[PDB]
Amino acid sequence: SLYPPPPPYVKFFTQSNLEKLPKYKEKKAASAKEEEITCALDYLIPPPMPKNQQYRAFGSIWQENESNYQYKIQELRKLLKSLLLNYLELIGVLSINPDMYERKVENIRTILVNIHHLLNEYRQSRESLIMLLEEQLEYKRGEIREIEQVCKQVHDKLTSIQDTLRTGS
Amino acid sequence: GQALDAVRMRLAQLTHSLRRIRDEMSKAELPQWYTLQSQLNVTLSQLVSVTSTLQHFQETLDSTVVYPLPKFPTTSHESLVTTLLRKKNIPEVDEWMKYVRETSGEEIEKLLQQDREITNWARTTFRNEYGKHDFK
Amino acid sequence: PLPTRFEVELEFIQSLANIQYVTYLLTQQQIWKSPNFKNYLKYLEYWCNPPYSQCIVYPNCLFILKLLNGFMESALEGLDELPKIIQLQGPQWMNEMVERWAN
């Protein structure tokens, strides 16, 4: 069907199984002193994390104070200059002998592809943390400073009123 | 189109009667019993007329073929189109007749003719019983 | 190879986010009638803490199951209103998820 069937073990665990789970896990721990499914109550025991700390799904694999970059910068600049130079040479190829133009085209793309690699090491979450950091920091400083400004102006008004009433005495 | 027009007007008046009985039941105070009986009987006999007239003109309704308008936009009104398109019964009625058939559960044919003869015999017996005593 | 129970339970949890899946599951009588399914739903609650929460793909179901948790004391009735209510309350629920995680 369109919707896959519920998992099979879901139907094994009734309320009685839930209430008898404590004694079952106590007995299992006492006896113990891929997990084989010898009893229907085994699944409620929390599954163990794989030792390799890896998870595979759909053909793809998955697994501290914030809780020479100049070399990369100059590499990027020289790569951009070489990319412009190669673009000029490739368009010249198109001009004179376009029949073999593709011979350079993908080459240029490789440099562009390398640029993407040069982005990968530069990857930005810390920079986003920084920018959010300063925006809420400056917002709270603005709120604070307007607080002492308003309380100070109220105090100044109170002192002026006190002087006015003392003069009228 | 004439048959569907008559179906339209009769179903419209039936829906009007339903709206009526609705807005006189929605009141916090229940009216007199007799008014409720009158409304019930009128609306229910009207439903009978609806059923009979729908029975009469099945051929005209069947002959008609449903097709969306060229001017009607389905991109924006696909939800509205699907709302009227769907026809599956409400589930509770479904398991209702499923349990009904479960409870009910050449042999069948001869039971059928035995039911025929019981029906005819009972009809004749009650005709005789009515004729036995003068009711006028 | 045969996937482990981790993979199937995680995929079930992430598929619970679909409104169509929830509507289909609640359409059948015996799914809600059987206490086994709700027992499994309450068992699934323990994935809201790390490091399990680091393995999720769509955080919305995190509330949905919790919303489904509410369904055991709110009633089936309300199944029809489920798509409308999720569409209407998507903004504030996404905001509260962001507050729970992004802050």
Binding site: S1, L2 | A12, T15, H16, R19, S79, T82, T83, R86, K88, N89, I90, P91 | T23, Y24, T27, L79, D80, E81, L82, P83, K84
Partner: peptide, 25 residues
């Protein structure tokens, strides 16, 4: 003329009961 038109009694909240099953290829 027409004494009164009918009030709109649309029920979009109705969930419908369309059976879906031939999705797998």
């Amino acid at each position: 003329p027409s004494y009164s038109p009918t009030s709109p009694s649309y029920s979009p909240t109705s969930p419908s009961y369309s059976p879906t099953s031939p999705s797998y290829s």
